[PDB]
Amino acid sequence: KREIVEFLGIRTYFFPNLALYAVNNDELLVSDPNKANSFAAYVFGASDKKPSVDDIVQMLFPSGSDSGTILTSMDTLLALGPDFLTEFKKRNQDLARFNLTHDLSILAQGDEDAAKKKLNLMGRKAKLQKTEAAKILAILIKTINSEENYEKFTELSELCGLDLDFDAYVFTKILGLEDEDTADEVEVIRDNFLNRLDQTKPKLADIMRNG
Amino acid sequence: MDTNKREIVEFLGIRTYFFPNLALYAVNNDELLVSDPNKANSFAAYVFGASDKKPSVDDIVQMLFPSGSDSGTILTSMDTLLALGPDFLTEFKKRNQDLARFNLTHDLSDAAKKKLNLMGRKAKLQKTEAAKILAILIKTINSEENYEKFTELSELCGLDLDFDAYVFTKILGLEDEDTADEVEVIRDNFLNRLDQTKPKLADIMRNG
Ligand SMILES: [Cl-]
């Protein structure tokens, strides 16, 4: 089941290992950020150096990941876009040996366009269900089916309705969705997250707010 | 109510922002809707499936603005008039002129639609029901065709305002071959609440 989790003021669906990293390496990020993980340091505003694709994959799929971790991170791969589809397919092929699969596997099976029209209708009905799990699936589908970056940002912004502002912000940062057309909205998303992080980790929040 | 703030209200299982007088009417008059629907209110009878006669603009306005409405009731019902489109804008302007004598006004009183669009996007990101309702209203107003308008009104279900989404779908004629399966989900969400408090209303809406 798609389940939101929380780590000491960081509420997340898509990025649980990144949230855990920030819990475990708070002092490092605040006091010696050039020793910290590059993906974490970039997200939290402690470095302007961009993470590599490999940095992202290793944070999503740490050694020893179990099937639940893998399935959740495969959702994140889909949200990040076609750059990550080969990684998604490799992870899905491995799961099949255990009789497991990602529930949106039709996206990896050719005729992607036809699958996305069917998924569009599925996602619209999922959003009308009353569970967090269904609403996450709906947002994921709408994000996958977005062509342009402004549309992708608009659909990912719906994560804030589930108090997943952290995830919306991480996607914005990693996918480069902040520009002149979206900057004022990105500021609201960032501030929503920081208003919560201030309550548990104010020094880390201060880095993110300033530097 | 005697407040400027947008507030969701509830009456016996019926949660609503845009149609509080209609919700209360149905709670008070469910047996009449069952047993003598032609003598019941025509707007209520149409929404709940007791009659296929469409209400008039005047029937709808009278339900939204009953005798004795206070300022919050007027302001809320003015939101409803905006979402109901061009046949209701003259009434909106009449009501807004009344309010000005008391130093009150509706807060939304191509260029304006772009400014409104940016305002609605930032409102949706706030953490209050009042801001989310405003955002949905703006997105509805700025919609240019029925399928887009239905898509934006559907967001009301995210605030458990399925009743309002259903009423708008019925009055604006938004149920068609493209939207019918989604309309069924909205209807079923509302029926799920009704089955627990007004089984009679649920039965009419399912049967007749
Ligand atoms: Cl879609």
Author numbering:
A (entry chain A): 5 to 215
B (entry chain C): 1 to 109, 117 to 215
Authors' account:
Two PGL proteins, PGL-1 and PGL-3, are key scaffolding proteins required for proper P granule assembly. PGL proteins can self-assemble into granules, both in vitro using purified recombinant protein9,11,12 and in intestinal nematode cells or mammalian cells in culture when expressed on their own. These in vitro PGL granules display liquid droplet behavior, indicating that PGL protein alone is sufficient to recapitulate the biophysical properties of P granules in nematode cells. Assays for granule assembly in mammalian cells implicated the conserved N-terminal region of PGL as critical, and structural studies identified a central dimerization domain (DD) within that conserved region.
The NtDD has a novel fold consisting of 11 alpha helices and a single N-terminal beta strand. While each ASU possessed two pairs of identical interfaces, one of these interface pairs consisted of a network of conserved amino acid side chains making extensive salt bridges and hydrogen bonds. The complexity and conservation of these interactions suggested biological relevance. We conclude that the dimers observed in the crystal structure represent the NtDD dimer detected in solution.
